[PDB]
């Protein structure tokens, strides 16, 4: 996790 | 001052206004008003209009109480949407007891009281720069919101482009024509999410601008066949919406947070303010995040704060200090969401900051090593504590804090606690469709 | 015993069985099995069939592990639904390590271990009488459950009547045909809610009967175009589903809870058992109520328990003592819901009761004055404490209790805690439609 | 309150 | 009871 | 990651 | 015969049965774990009650042989393009060359049962592989280990997935080929695996698989259009 909104495009 | 009585009368005389809204803000933050014809403008400006003051309490009101409706002349605004036979103008008014004493149950009067307490400490102004962000949802045939976003845009993207649409551009321009001071705007991280930043101003003026901004954004989005919501987290797995608050304290007309000869170019007053905000952070979360949905945003992985710490550059810090210094030296509190009552949130933030300044509390060391790396136990030994995970936990934390109780007074405290306890009780007893999807067939 | 190897071989010989299910129970209580052809019956009865023992851990399994599948001959049951070319029979099996040691991660083996500990205290039998409640929901054209109940019945009503339907009657008769001992049946308080009570039996046999009862009820409801669920609270504002557990402890073949010269006709052993259950009630709630939905049932006003107290006649007590005495003297725990794992719930209940007996704890005074009217603070000064309000709170309480940890061993403890923590984390981050109904338009 | 399941018929 | 019109929003 | 097939039920 | 019968019976029930290694993304794939046992004079040659793990020296040589050629026969045991979408972490499918008795997705797993039932399980094989060719290459690798008395590496029981690829390359843990083309490249260079199926089978298999990879690599999949048609 720790990064979900930024990589939500993928 | 910006307007006088003669200026108001002359302006309504040529502009031909027939309806005047004497608007105010209740406990829950929704905009309320009592409406009068233009023939009652003289009575309104004489601080003589009465109304039921219990409407401030919201749905927990028990008894009718007569209150006065002292309007503020500087808040006079002419709405651009004409009401057929005549225009509509608004005043933002204070609530006063029948004996002339300001009503202790008015959030705006409470904020003014906290500002008076701040002035008693030697400071002059308390500036707020808000960063409200919202989602735009398409309406269906029946004119009710759906779950479809207006665009699949990204962070700072040129997504709406030219060729019509671009509701953010229209909102910004229209707000400019109404006297707002818009700093900048951009597309937010989540699809269908937008942010508009105002220029910093006084606390009362900033809160009034926040309420007017919400009203205007909702109206303009409704014009474009869209639904604008300031819900903290309308969708799961998608970026939430915050109302990052840039706070700056002024003394004798100069920024009291700036000190060129100190480390990080931060004054001792700024460090005391940061310490005060850190100490009470878990206590005013119930006020800055007053809804059940507010705590679905406060989850890791979406840049929303989840732990009590301050930094100059970190992934989702509770308190962030922008690189700009000098007159623009400020401390940003990122836990606040747009659903919060601006007056109450500003009151509790200012009270915590003044508590830090008054007792000269020592700010903890800034964190720059990604607290998300270690476990909760692996960071509890430091000063990093967790924000409340539910509205009930935040309510429990808020009740126990003695200082935060006087930040809004006994009347506001009791009514806010009652309303929020009822809200939580309604939520915790519901059976959500997720539970049926998880257990109806499994068990 | 009831069956031997020769009896099983002869029975499958005439009944012409071709498929044998070697069923077992995992952490979450769902029935798992590995299937063999009838040609492998000799290998199965030799305790030689291997399988992946990590399947007991559920969705938190990590590494494959080989374990044996020791079947129980007394659990042999022939399913009445013929499977085309040949019949299907089932064995309920214990899980054993490859070295012959019983697997510590098997809930049934854990219950047997707790029963061995009970026998070490001098007692002989631990009888359980369950009262599982369930709801019947109509299926749609696509054969999936809906929210429409099968009847608008009432408490003990003759609602289904004659003239077909009456799925409860068919279930009871069919269960009687499979060797179950049904005591009585009736319509429950909520519409579409039914209860079937079995005769009391040994703890292992009672849990096996509970699992088989769930399977058979679901199958027969699927026959009638209905959905049967043991979910604790499928609907809001309607009575939930409980699995009240009538517990009786026997010593030398006689009831140890009965004393004809003592007050309430209760022995000192019964009082110690009640004290032990009361002491650990907040700790084993996580096991007896293992789902998120379980705590929507634990709300006042629906006869479900909400406070730790015992009584002979009260509105929704945690522990109820029926009026019948003598051989039928028993203590009823009403907090258990049908979603709980029968083996784990029985293990924790028996462990708490034995802890009360071993330490000779003193039972509190019975409550016979309707504590519900008293406020939470108005009853906290007494011995009345609240049950955990959420699954997370119950997990926190369960982790701290040392006795309850040994009640199921380290393997079961860690895997159950991990699974339930994941379950709670999934629930707490969701955005339910209730939140959008409450905040999307208001904010 | 204190009685909702029983009185739900009304 | 004693408060139904005000609390009807829930 | 490291566990996706087993936890896919959620 | 099992594949044929399963397909036929599933067709009878109005169902489609597929032995595709990975028909769906984000969901566990399909394996054809092969339990191999070698016998000598009618007794199990992998069993030795007096040795550690109750494993004979022949079993250790067999494991060493399978480990040495594991990256080479992957092209035969995983002969399709879709085979390598299953060989991804997080779905119990093997991704690295290691052997263990209890681990999360090891390449070689040794079941707890011993004695006559002593065996070594190769979990990389998928049902799409040709059974005869896969068995041939596995047996050839095992015999190569036995013939040269290769030394088996230490078993892994600490969850290789924890540390990074650079944090495990210094050990004996190497990665399986990531694509069919990489596996073909590895298979061509292994001399021992070449004789495992002979020159005729080798050339025809290589030609067919190279054509298969070339057809796949030049396609424009809908994922590319969803990712780039509107972005660019
Ligand atoms: N990247 C950003 O500044 C967005 C902030 C984020 N939407 C929040 O809720 O705080
Ligand atoms: N009348 C009853 O005993 C029903 C009990 C209730 N349904 C419960 O959930 O406990
Ligand atoms: N649990 C299992 O053994 C399944 C194995 C997994 N499906 C694979 O492709 O290897
Ligand atoms: Mg932003
Ligand atoms: Mg910001
Ligand atoms: Mg009942
Ligand atoms: Mg009962
Ligand atoms: Mg296998």
Residue numbers in the entry:
A (entry chain b), D (entry chain a), E (entry chain M), F (entry chain E): 1 to 10
B (entry chain R), C (entry chain Q): 2 to 444
G (entry chain C): 213 to 444
Sentences from the paper on this structure:
To ascertain if this is a conserved mechanism among FBI-GS-GlnR complexes and to elucidate, in detail, the molecular mechanism by which low G + C Gram-positive FBI-GS proteins bind GlnR, we utilized single-particle cryo-electron microscopy (cryo-EM) and solved high-resolution structures of the Bs (1.96 Å), Lm (2.61 Å), Pp (2.07-2.28 Å), and Sa (2.15 Å) FBI-GS-GlnR C-tail complexes. Notably, the Bs and Lm GS proteins in the complexes were all tetradecameric, while the Pp GS in the complex formed 10% tetradecamers and 90% dodecamers and the GS in the Sa FBI-GS-GlnR structure was all dodecameric. Peptide density was evident for 8-10 residues of the GlnR C-tails from Pp (IQGELSRF), Sa (PINRGDLSRF), and Bs (FRQGDMSRF), and 5 GlnR C-terminal residues (QLPRF), in the Lm complex. The GlnR C-tails in all but the Lm structure contains a glycine at the N-terminal region of the bound peptide (XG(E/D)XSRF). This glycine binds proximal to the E flap, allowing its amide nitrogen to H bond with the carbonyl oxygen of the GS glycine residue in the E flap. Arg62´ (Bs numbering) from the D50´ loop interacts with an acidic residue that is generally conserved in GlnR C-tails (XG(E/D)XSRF).
In Gram-positive bacteria, nitrogen homeostasis is controlled by an operon encoding glutamine synthetase (GS), a dodecameric machine that assimilates ammonium into glutamine, and the GlnR repressor. GlnR detects nitrogen excess indirectly by binding glutamine-feedback-inhibited-GS (FBI-GS), which activates its transcription-repression function.
